[PDB]
Amino acid sequence: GYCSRILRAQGTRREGYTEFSLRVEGDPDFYKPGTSYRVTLSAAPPSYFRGFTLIALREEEDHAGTFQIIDEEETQFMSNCPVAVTESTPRRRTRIQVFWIAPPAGTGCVILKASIVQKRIIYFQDEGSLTKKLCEQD
């Protein structure tokens, strides 16, 4: 896209299931328009991350719901790409969380995508454990 290009500039592609996981609490099968979901990004022990990004896109542009910050000490909108969420400061973390408010009916499938930096290498993928797709109910 455009934010995507910025977010991937220094990136190492690692597809599939990895020690870093993007999940939605309650493991929903689909989204309901306008519902808020708690999205989490975490490291399996003893791993951690120092930085991340998180973006939602339409299956690709950006009328893809709305993030809402839960923890201002740990996370913020990225000024470079205001629709994306990112760390407030580099520091070792094992979990971050945010709200995502599902878009209006007729939007179609949304893909939530996270990138992760632990030390120097920035990891991203198109599919796997940093990727969560949710569609409207069949």
Next chain:
Amino acid sequence: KSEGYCSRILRAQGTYTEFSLRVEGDPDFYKPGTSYRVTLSAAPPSYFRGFTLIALRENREGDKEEDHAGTFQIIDEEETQFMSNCPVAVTESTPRRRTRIQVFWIAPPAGTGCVILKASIVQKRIIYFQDEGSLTKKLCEQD
């Protein structure tokens, strides 16, 4: 030995634009012993987290300390540092999102010959540097 300092600093073989490496005053040539201000910057709305900066004798690979020329000097010790595996190279100390970093580089003695200052924004175990483009600047003796 099989594992010297700078073993992970290499030249890309075969073949970006938002990112620029610049020497303050944009000198044509270098004067030995002078301190030059060198900045890596991202054009808005771009950013980088880590980076690696080196200065090489022209036509050298970079993977031996003896390939490197002049002396980098740290300005912001908080979040830039010398690379522990290659003490003549400069890197970030944290993966903070950045739009600019700066260092001094003291030019080498008369007779050193042309130097290529090079930055890389690609963060991998092996760091490949481009021979030309926006992340490199060549400086020869002003002579």
